[PDB]
Design a protein around this ligand. Sequence first.
Ligand SMILES: CCNC(=O)[C@H]1O[C@@H](n2cnc3c(N)ncnc32)[C@H](O)[C@@H]1O
Lengths: 51, 225, 283, 336
Amino acid sequence: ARKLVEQLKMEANIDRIKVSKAAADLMAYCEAHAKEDPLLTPVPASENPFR
Amino acid sequence: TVSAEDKAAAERSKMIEKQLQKDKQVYRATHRLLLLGADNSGKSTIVIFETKFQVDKVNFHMFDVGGQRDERRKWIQCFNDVTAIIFVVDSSDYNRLQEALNDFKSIWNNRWLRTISVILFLNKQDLLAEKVLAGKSKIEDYFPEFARYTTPEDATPEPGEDPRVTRAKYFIRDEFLRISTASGDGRHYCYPHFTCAVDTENARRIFNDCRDIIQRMHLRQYELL
Amino acid sequence: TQDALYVALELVIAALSVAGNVLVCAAVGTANTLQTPTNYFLVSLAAADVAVGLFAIPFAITISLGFCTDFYGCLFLACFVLVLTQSSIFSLLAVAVDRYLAICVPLRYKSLVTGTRARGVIAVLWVLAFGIGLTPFLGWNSKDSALVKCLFENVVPMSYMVYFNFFGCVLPPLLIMLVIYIKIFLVACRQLQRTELRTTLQREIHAAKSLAMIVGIFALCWLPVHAVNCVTLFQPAQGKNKPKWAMNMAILLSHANSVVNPIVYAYRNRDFRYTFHKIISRY
Amino acid sequence: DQLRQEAEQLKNQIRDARKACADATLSQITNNIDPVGRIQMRTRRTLRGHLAKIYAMHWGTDSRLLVSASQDGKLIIWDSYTTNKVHAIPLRSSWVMTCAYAPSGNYVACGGLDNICSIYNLKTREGNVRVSRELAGHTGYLSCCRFLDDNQIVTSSGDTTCALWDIETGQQTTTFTGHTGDVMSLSLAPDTRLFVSGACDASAKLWDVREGMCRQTFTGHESDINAICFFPNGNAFATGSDDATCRLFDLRADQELMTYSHDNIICGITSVSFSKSGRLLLAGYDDFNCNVWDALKADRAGVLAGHDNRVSCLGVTDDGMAVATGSWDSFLKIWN
Ligand SMILES: CCNC(=O)[C@H]1O[C@@H](n2cnc3c(N)ncnc32)[C@H](O)[C@@H]1O
């Protein structure tokens, strides 16, 4: 339809960033919260509410 | 270390469990059936979304889903434990018949319904009889292979009818049985019937063939069939 | 010589029975899919079999050895053996009737068999077995005839086993099982005649072979003991002089049922095989 | 036609623009991190009481209660600490496929094949759970509904459109109709500003709440899409398909980043979830077991094989202490 071609217009002008920066941000977020993830590093049984 | 709150919680849980036991008792002893058809098939007047009925002190549930569209492959995964699937097919319209056969193929070949039996209801036989008695029938035009067909010897025509109507009537059943015979054996079968609009014996037929399906499954479970 | 063979074979039978019958109970307990109303009768049968293999046999050699003790310290062992052996026959009848009910009454099977009714039936079966077994203590003994030599015939008379434990505790179950397993065969033959129209005969022979062994094993295992008892009771001329090991062979055949029950009833079903395969593969 | 030529030109423009921004592959830049290792999880509690197959499960904000729905037509509210049952709400339709728990903890939601979304109020005054509102605007079967606040809700159905509903007025405010097939998954951003949708067209789209316009689309799958979830940072999302693959997408790059798959897996994906740190991906499968994947290395970590039928649902608490798994055996399992 005449609206479908119009829709594709705003899907092309959005600025796009290199994948390297996104990967670096993802790595930083993953490594900045590693000590508060009980599943990855199990907590001692004293503080575990599922025993 | 149990306080009053824990005791109240335990009492509430016990009441809930008792109600659940009653619900399980009333639920596990009923049978479920799913009805399928197309528009103008007359699927709403064989006995609307749900229906309960009992025969010989045995319960039966009837389900119908019609708010969807032609594609149904997504919500058919839920109905993997139904006892049987009822299929209603019209026979008055010759043009809108081949399409119906296609709708029968997928149901017979769907991977989620590999162990589910199907009960066929060829509806509107009076209309077919009147149409074929009159001279405006053109069955050969809509189906080229009808010319060579002859009535099977195993057929049991009802006394007091034209031979032409019984020939045309069994012709339609032939192609519906052909699909069942081509694929699938030992897990599910078809049970043909000739249902009219005024017939009142449908419940007995469903009782009889559902009993056969259940008996066959139970015989197969002990590995002696 | 003969006694050594008898006791050794009894010990071997007890060991095999306990080893085979612990597995069925463990599998039923540890599997959620096998917690069905049908499997409760099977687990009751397995429990009766393992209890027999753990208690009845050693008591049997204790009785048959021929040592001296008090009169009432021997009847207790005899009655315990009788109770433990009768429970197995009652469980076999229960599983037979459960099997018949599903096939010959298909639509009303679910509404008639529930956990509550199955538990009640099992409790009644065990209570009736205990009641039948302990009847001699009520006064059906041989004290007036006769510190006391422990032989099975000295404590409990032959007027009890033939008339009460055979004519009212063994034969009617066999007749009921025969009727049930003939009717099921007829139903299966009709359903195959309808199906066909391999060959029909090659699938009829398989069903006949499968249904025949259940009754044949029971008939081979239980009849000879009571046949010998009837021979002893009725005609004394033949009964008085017979080889000793003839009675021992009957005892062995009667106690050999505990190792053949799980193979016929439990290991053949598909659900048990699937659960065993999954457990073996995982472990 | 001229219109199709313009569409082809625009599609090629989009393709080359996407190709231009590709800097480096993830494998070359992930080859220096320390591997997670082997993760072993054991079942702690098994919750029984359901009759039929179980189709949905949602946790709460306090990581204390959960809600379960089954084909028997009943909602159960549990307490995972002591395996109690706080409430059991009967339903009007036996067919249900959606559940939701309000962040404030006063409301629950349900929906199914009856084309109507039902809202139930929990903290009442008379002591009985009473239905508050019913929404009946869609024309297809609902697939998933998630709350935004105490007075707004978002729903997706088989009518190839998604909708936003305001509870008090009862009339929807904005509908999104860019899709061409059955939409059957959606997840919300942590800041409650955008949300993603996955359709039956092997495609996913990201929508804006107040704008009401599709802002960015992603494709690459070859079959149906069954589940989708949001990364904790709000800048990525992972999707699962019937091609037995999981695919990770970034929003700022408009491109694929990672693909998790193996040659020994043939069944389909039915549920996907993330962890608190974003280092772990949990995926339920069709072969009676779940799997754990490393989001930055594309390697297996462990198998949570403890079920006997399909594992339909999957959830992770806000604090990440436990993982809940439902199945078609009418059983729920809690792992830690
Ligand atoms: C329910 C019937 N049970 C028995 O016959 C058991 O009793 C024992 N038994 C019965 N009659 C005799 C006998 N005459 N001598 C030794 N044991 C016997 C057998 O070992 C059987 O296992």
